[PDB]
């Protein structure tokens, strides 16, 4: 979930 | 000796490379204080840059002109308070080292007291009382340019100041309040160096 | 363990009056 | 063949940050809204904080302490009398 | 009043990751494409 | 294949033709009594020794940098004039409306300096505290990473003849040379 | 609140341009010899970076301060001339009925000087043991409160031209500069 | 001290003997590689000047033209192979100190590289790897000119390198290879000596 | 900007 965020 | 004769008749003005310390304190401005922010970015309440060029009419801006590059020693801001102790309300007070952030394109406030409190020097009391604020120190030692921006903020300003607001201007009896207040005023007391002088546009 | 900077908390009372 | 090597000891961390403010009301109105304000109380549940970030880096938490201090914004010329407390069971609401 | 404590040293953090795949191929086409992997070196640059 | 890293500063010393001077006989438009503009920077003239070195390293300081004119004129012509070199690429001088205040603002910079076109002249850069390095090569964005600064050259005076009287046309007078010292860091080659 | 006292005292170097200066062919008037006349003191020019250097501090002492005239003019002109920096502001040479005492005077005068204007001079100021300070800005009662003193720029000679003989009219023959140091007291703003 | 003053309006530019270490790596170029050899002359494949100007495009090539003379400290010749080890070939490598012998003049292969395998530093290898090459020194350390030649080579190179190609290119199936192979590339690692700086033609 | 990214 903190990568997701990351990539747009 | 030779060198008062050599001094008599050739048009050689000296270099004169080297630092300047120099000491002083300065009268910043009026702040003020909503009853009902509602906007969130309302939150924020007074934002200043951190160079000596961007407060016009004062001693800071006078003597900045004249030079080349600073780099501040202490910068050390001071709020005094001009409100009876029965009126309440609450503030808080931060210096950023990185002029381009810009807390204020978040949507939630509570992100942005969060980060307020976060980063070393934050400062929230009352604001019936005064207090005091410091910059941290950076490693590196560079130098900054004076005078006002020109595309990139980063080779001028060493940071950036911000006033916020926190909970609500409040009245006796506890009704929010109307309008506006004057709250109180922010002070610098300063120590600077300076490089090469000139005069600048 | 890793410590972390902390907040450190200050002030005090105020007085209705100052006597002098 | 490149391997990223194994641990299992836990790790401590202190620190302290910053909940919220909070309100009240002069009208005692629904009665159901006496229930003023609600805060979960994890790791990677307070965006704008340093743990916040650092809690992705791991698998599991435990919090070993966790003291809320509340800090008065009003002169002693007001009341309001109120209470505070950290129920352990996330499914539980008052609400109801 | 409530004050965050200020520091000013440095801290090291050693370690270790994986920047990623990358591919060749049998025709010299383009001659601008000889290029063929481009990477930033900074922190936060490398999601994951 | 040991392929070796190096770290080192590498000291070059030289000196190059900058190029022509000239001067009008009465200036009227204050923004055209400024008379010449170059930038200090390696990699800003054509076929020089030095543009030639800079391309071949990632970064520059120079240690000194002085300009020296030379005149080109009969001693019975005269008309006074300034040159100063400005540290601050990005504070553009044109600006300026009034002639005075150009004279004034060019004369408070140090190591800036005034005579008769007649005769030589030597002029030094300022020194920095950071010992900043600068990268090499044409502005891609900001001159202020790249250049040291700006020169100027800056007519005061009319240009008058013998009996004292102005003349009706500008007119070559001299040219400007560099003697110079650099430092460099990380060998490459610009794209 | 621990607003903090300071009574150090404040070294600053600097340079800046006091303007042009003319000569007439044939003076007669004797009090028309004397040419240029200038306060030696912060605050009292046009737009110079020492001006606004000024007004930031109570009180002010010159540890050097030499004028320096840079000629404007060909060799086949000449004259002679003189410059001197009277240390008391009330003296005014102007009364004088006589150009003869006028020029004796002058000369009297340590560290006054004569040359002709086709070349440059440096003068100097004299120093006081007193280590007395001087109030900064603008005269209010006394001009000997304020000033260290005042220069004079005054001609000599006719002006001949070449073939020797005087020109109908008066002319442009360079301009002043100033380098110098300075002591500063208590820091304020004037009002 | 009266340096300064007479320094400020006399045309005197300094003079500048001395020496100058500089240090670098450049790119030579391809190498190929014959499946049928039979000229004897053929057997010869790379023949380089080993002079910092005789390489252009590169990076010695533009600095050397900004002096007058040189003298290398080290000089350092590296191989890279593009080629699979299925393939096989042989090939050998040499430096010679004196410009004006020219091998190619010989009618016969085996004296070829014989001549090849006599003088220090020499270096034979399988064309499937890498291999490393140096000079020899000269004990009187002359100085040496720059530039393009100009009737006599001995003023200019200090020495000659030679890729001489061994065996025939061969294939997988072992059938002698058609036409030619691409094989590997040339590199260099430097180190020099400049003396008195200039621009020529 | 991390922040931004975590508040929808």
């Given at each position: 979930?903190?990568?997701?965020?990351?990539?747009? | 000796?030779p060198?008062?004769?050599?001094?008599?008749?050739?048009?050689?003005?000296q270099?004169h490379?080297?630092?300047?310390?120099?000491?002083?304190?300065?009268?910043?401005?009026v702040?003020?204080?909503?009853?009902?922010?509602?906007?969130?970015?309302?939150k924020?309440?007074?934002?200043?840059?951190?160079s000596?060029s961007?407060?016009?009419?004062?001693?800071?801006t006078?003597?900045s002109?004249?030079?080349e590059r600073?780099v501040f020693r202490?910068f050390?801001?001071?709020?005094?308070?001009?409100?009876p102790?029965?009126?309440?309300?609450?503030?808080?007070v931060?210096?950023?080292?990185?002029?381009?952030?810009?807390?204020?394109?978040?949507?939630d406030?509570?992100?942005?007291l969060?980060?307020?409190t976060?980063q070393?020097?934050?400062?929230?009391?009352?604001?019936?009382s005064?207090?005091?604020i410091?910059?941290?120190?950076?490693?590196?030692?560079?130098?900054?340019?004076t005078?006002?921006?020109?595309?990139?903020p980063?080779f001028?300003?060493?940071?950036?100041?911000?006033?916020i607001?926190?909970?609500?201007?409040?009245?006796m009896?506890?009704?929010?309040?109307?309008?506006?207040?004057?709250?109180?005023?922010?002070?610098?007391?300063?120590?600077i160096?300076f490089?090469?002088?000139?005069?600048?546009? | 363990?890793?410590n972390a900077?902390?907040?450190?908390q200050?002030?005090?009372?105020?007085?209705?009056?100052?006597?002098?």
């Amino acid at each position: 979930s903190a990568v997701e965020a990351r990539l747009p | 000796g030779p060198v008062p004769l050599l001094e008599s008749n050739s048009n050689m003005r000296q270099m004169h490379n080297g630092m300047t310390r120099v000491v002083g304190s300065d009268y910043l401005g009026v702040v003020s204080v909503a009853g009902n922010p509602a906007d969130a970015a309302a939150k924020v309440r007074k934002v200043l840059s951190v160079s000596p060029s961007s407060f016009p009419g004062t001693r800071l801006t006078q003597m900045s002109d004249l030079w080349e590059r600073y780099v501040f020693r202490q910068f050390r801001v001071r709020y005094v308070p001009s409100v009876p102790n029965t009126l309440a309300c609450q503030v808080m007070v931060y210096q950023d080292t990185d002029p381009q952030d810009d807390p204020t394109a978040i949507k939630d406030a509570d992100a942005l007291l969060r980060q307020a409190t976060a980063q070393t020097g934050s400062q929230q009391w009352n604001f019936n009382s005064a207090k005091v604020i410091h910059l941290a120190k950076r490693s590196d030692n560079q130098l900054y340019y004076t005078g006002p921006v020109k595309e990139n903020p980063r080779f001028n300003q060493q940071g950036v100041v911000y006033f916020i607001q926190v909970s609500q201007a409040l009245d006796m009896n506890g009704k929010p309040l109307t309008a506006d207040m004057e709250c109180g005023s922010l002070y610098v007391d300063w120590v600077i160096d300076f490089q090469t002088p000139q005069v600048n546009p | 363990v890793q410590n972390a900077p902390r907040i450190q908390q200050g002030g005090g009372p105020v007085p209705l009056l100052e006597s002098n």
